[PDB]
Subunit: 385 residues, 4 copies
């Protein structure tokens, strides 16, 4: 059945899950406390193709279906949000943009390593002054003999550090209309330079501790002519496509986190007793479980659908935005109800439910805030009829 | 393509919807205020075999999948909630119960007429004293020479006054334990008796006005031996199975109504302007549209999944409950938002959104209230911990 | 205590409530179905001075505080939403506007009749082409010799067909910029004219059936020079003030309806039995009752506060908007839950909960939609800081 | 006006707020990271009579009204949630219980030090096994020669490790029916003992880092005859009253935290812009601001109401529970929306909104979970009429 794991998926997810429980799960709590970038697990995960999941085998990638890649992200997120974000962003953003707008030359130069894991990718779109209106990037890319002169600063760029390959957006030409500033922007891919690129101090986050998020400062950074990704002044349109893909991944990440929280509360409730009976026998508890279960089930069907469309070469901007919005909002709520079901213990770090919420909370913000996705969704509904 | 309409589905739905737009849509508003049972449309719908949708062609049915049946219910609901309910209940309860537990002789005796729509089916389970706790039925059936004697009252029976075939659940033997009243109940299928069955006045309802609803008073009704449907005292297990199938139909009915409300508000939002601009541009309206569209898509995926599981012969109690719960809640909220988007006009009957809400409101109550469904969902979740 | 009914309030409300239970309550169900305007009740209510609640006794009014008037509206709404709306609108809009901006000559000419209930007042602001954007009126007032000429259409006017006194807002002077349209609007108060005013047919509404609502068509209507209410072109500033007073009344109306719904559901749950126990013992029901009671208590405190501010001649735009927004949303939700608690019975008109919801649904739309109020609130909040 | 700060209240709050801004606010973020108990602030706060707020001047207290104390708790929670919990618990629980059930000897013995802050109080009710169903305590008190011997474990006890005075609930007599264990419990008040009391082992919390929270291990702890607080075996009844008072404190704590988050998002929104315009100009943002403001105003009115009923010596179990439930749920919601409004910066610890949520999250659990409170409210509503 379509909504279930096919025999081909059950053969890739089966062994991937064992690995997750044995090498990722045990150190999840500690990593949330330490915040130490898990280089080991990254190289260890790359083995399953995880870091080149969507890259064609020809380029070294594992050439998997966007559908399969999503289920793996869910699986990773079920045990470690931080890792899930690293994996999802690396593939969806940095790698995805290169594979999407890269020439055969650019692809050959980056994809093999990215898909390998020996080089992590950073996607610089978000800046300090434009957390939502992306097209309003102030980072510049002035034409210079030999290449370009990138001048600007990126903010909250996943893999800001630890990044071997970078993809940065920058305006190279006028909008011209202040409105449509989406035109005039260009994308530039390149390897970690040795001058002109400063990596700000590590940002302390509410959760996803171990994930790498840094500020990027570009002081007169030169990039070869071979850096421009896509058509000059048309990179933002490739950006939107990349995000659509990214959103599918984030949705799966959300579901993973929400499912973990739910499974935990389910088990807890069945055991924990109050007033002479399992707290689960109380509707106040059962209703929360039922609601969460139902919504996460719907969240999953939504990203599976979005992934199915993407693989079919059909439009999915609306469907990816719908999946991300729903999974994110539903997961965070399920996580919050888990905290409530655990009661006083839900408030203590000894248990995972508080981390689940902290990790999942970012899914309603990253790669398009829920508010942003609703406008995206509404615009599509309206332009349709 | 799983989530989209297939070639065989489209072959049926394409012409079916054309018929709905031309023959059903014109008079839905009028039927809502007069409550006049559309015998005309019943016969016309019956030409598409929709009154015996899940019945095998061998028995005069259309032999459709539960997936296609559900999509057709959704299509009808989009234009007329009362008709959708008429179709969904006739098929799922009375007809479905006979198809499920009926011997080959009973199926040959009842299905042909039920399937052709020549005789509508009424399913009498609910009583003035028990709805959610159906197992607490008070109606009784005494084994008499030549058959049985029925005595009791049924409440809120769809098609109660217009049906040619009746399926009634009644107590035949003690629990014997008060904790398990479910055991000891039996079902009886019989044609409209000339004596012994008194129909109460058509009750005034909040919505679904043209849907036939009535109280049934059984006074020493005599039914022959061939009336016993399923094992004596085992009727409740068939009831539960019938309800699982019925909930899929109700979920699709809700999606239909919610989709209609949303599409209406969209059209309105795109045209009606306030403060010098289409009200749709205001995030207050856009957010409502986005949220509703997103939940309805999820709702449809949920019932499709449940239908798929039922057709595969696999368990779907949990999945049918989840579909019905989510669909009804989502649909009702979308209808309430449509009323809000239309503002003052949403409060007047010259427009359909106030009717969409009144019609859909029943979906959160019939065939298992949302509260009942959450318990069903929670219990299933707890048994597979 | 402040939040409780004081000595003078109780001396008024004690006998008022006894009157409502015996004279208003018996026929509320019938009025909802027939829509017949209750002239007998209007007259009886008027003997309590309720039709001139806030009008100074010097002008034939009752001279009550806004706090007491609000409690009275709540009391009426508990038994008949239609009547509560009639009382609230008559007092807050037409009467309130004349009381607020009228010269002593106009007050003496109109208030005595309005305050005794001899003449009901209609306030025409909303139009077919504009509701929330009231300043975008199309109705026009032409300065003529001896008075003015009115031409335009008014939509959904309370008491529009039964009013003996009208207050109509019409454009008299062109606004400067296409933004500050709120300037250049004027108000006119006059008795029902023999010619010039055509009342459209009573509109069919979702609820508040017996409430008089009509469209007004003004064709070359001549009003004497004394009809001008307030400074020419400055009428919209009085409108905004009048609306602030109106929202307090509507908030109280909502509390009344929601409280009636909750009280009924409470009574039912205590008596209705399921699974061997009163439905109230199930947290699925108890939670609904608790949340509703809590929000209604909060809603009441909110309108009481705004009324106190108004009585103190203190600014209350923000506070009245908060009360109306919270009360309407809370009351509507409590009514929806009361329907759910009654299950199948909640869907039939033999019981009042379906009427409570239909009646209360208007409170989230009239006098400014919840969306409009949130903007009003957001803006006030942003100014102070 | 009632709902506003009166002359006597403003005399205290004006200087108190100046103190909070200057002394408490600057170190809040750091304390959330270190968890270091702020002894200097405790001492400075005590100078305001804050640690003996409800204690009569006769016993060395400040002798303030419950509403003034509540407003002071809200004011503190506005800048430091941990400190608010410290003040609220010390006053409401340990001190409140002694003031309530203590004899003149006991009050004279404990209140002076508690009220001056020279001795902080710990209240031991909750245990690793019984939280919600508190009457199911396992700690035991055995009557010995000239006193009692206590044995048990208390968990999540505020001020548990820094307290100078302890109040512990322990069963001294068997209950007649397990369904009513509320009978047979006793309370014991004593100073920090030399032996018999072992401090738990600091468990890390989601928020309120610097608030002292610890497990208490009682090993054959001896307490004199004069340790028994209240009547033997009737302690739980005083416990229920203590909680009613405590809930008012917690409600105010929630409001303070929510207001802080709202004000922050309010200030941010006004400056920060998106798409070439302040994000507050977007209804997505403005709607959030309006909803939270309205609910917080409602929450504040509810706790002021409960506070006055208690001060008036009237019933307030229902009202304190309503206030605590509403405020806690509303505050946590406002804090989550604040995080959302800040977007990416809402997820970084450099800004306070994430801490506001973490601190506020406990108010929905402590001193009776929202679920427990709803049952309390429902029981009262039902026992009513
Ligand atoms: Cl399709
Ligand atoms: Cl009162
Ligand atoms: Cl104040
Ligand atoms: Cl005081």
């Amino acid at each position: 059945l379509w909504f279930e794991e096919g025999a081909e998926e059950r053969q890739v997810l089966g062994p991937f899950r064992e690995f997750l429980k044995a090498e990722v799960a045990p150190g999840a709590a500690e990593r949330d406390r330490t915040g130490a970038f898990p280089w080991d697990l990254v190289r260890k995960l790359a083995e399953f193709g995880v870091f080149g999941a969507l890259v064609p085998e020809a380029y070294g990638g594992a050439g998997l279906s966007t559908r399969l890649f999503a289920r793996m992200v869910e699986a990773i997120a079920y045990y470690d949000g931080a890792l899930a974000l690293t994996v999802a962003s690396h593939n969806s953003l940095a790698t995805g943009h290169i594979l999407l707008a890269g020439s055969e030359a650019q692809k050959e130069a980056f994809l093999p390593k990215l898909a390998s894991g020996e080089a992590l990718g950073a996607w610089g779109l978000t800046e300090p002054g434009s957390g939502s209106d992306a097209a309003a990037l102030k980072t510049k890319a002035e034409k210079v003999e030999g290449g370009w002169r990138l001048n600007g600063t990126k903010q909250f760029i996943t893999q800001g550090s630890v990044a071997g390959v970078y993809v940065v957006m920058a305006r190279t030409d006028p909008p011209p209309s202040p409105e449509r500033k989406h035109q005039g922007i260009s994308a530039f891919a390149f390897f970690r330079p040795e001058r002109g690129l400063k990596v700000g101090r590590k940002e302390e986050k509410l959760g996803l501790t171990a994930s790498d998020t840094a500020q990027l400062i570009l002081e007169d950074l030169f990039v070869p002519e071979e850096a421009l990704l896509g058509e000059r002044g048309k990179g933002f349109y490739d950006v939107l496509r990349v995000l659509d893909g990214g959103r599918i991944g984030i949705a799966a990440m959300a579901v993973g986190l929400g499912q973990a929280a739910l499974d935990y509360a389910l088990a807890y409730a069945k055991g924990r007793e109050a007033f002479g009976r399992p707290i689960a026998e109380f509707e106040g508890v059962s209703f929360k479980l039922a609601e969460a279960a139902t919504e996460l089930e719907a969240a999953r069907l939504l990203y599976l659908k979005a992934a199915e469309l993407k693989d079919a070469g059909r439009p999915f901007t609306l469907e990816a935005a719908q999946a991300k919005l729903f999974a994110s909002e539903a997961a965070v709520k399920a996580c919050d109800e888990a905290i409530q079901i655990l009661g006083g213990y839900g408030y203590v770090k000894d248990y995972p439910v508080e981390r689940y919420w902290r990790d999942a909370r970012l899914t309603r913000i990253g790669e398009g805030t829920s508010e942003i996705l609703k406008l995206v969704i509404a615009r599509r509904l309206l332009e349709a009829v």
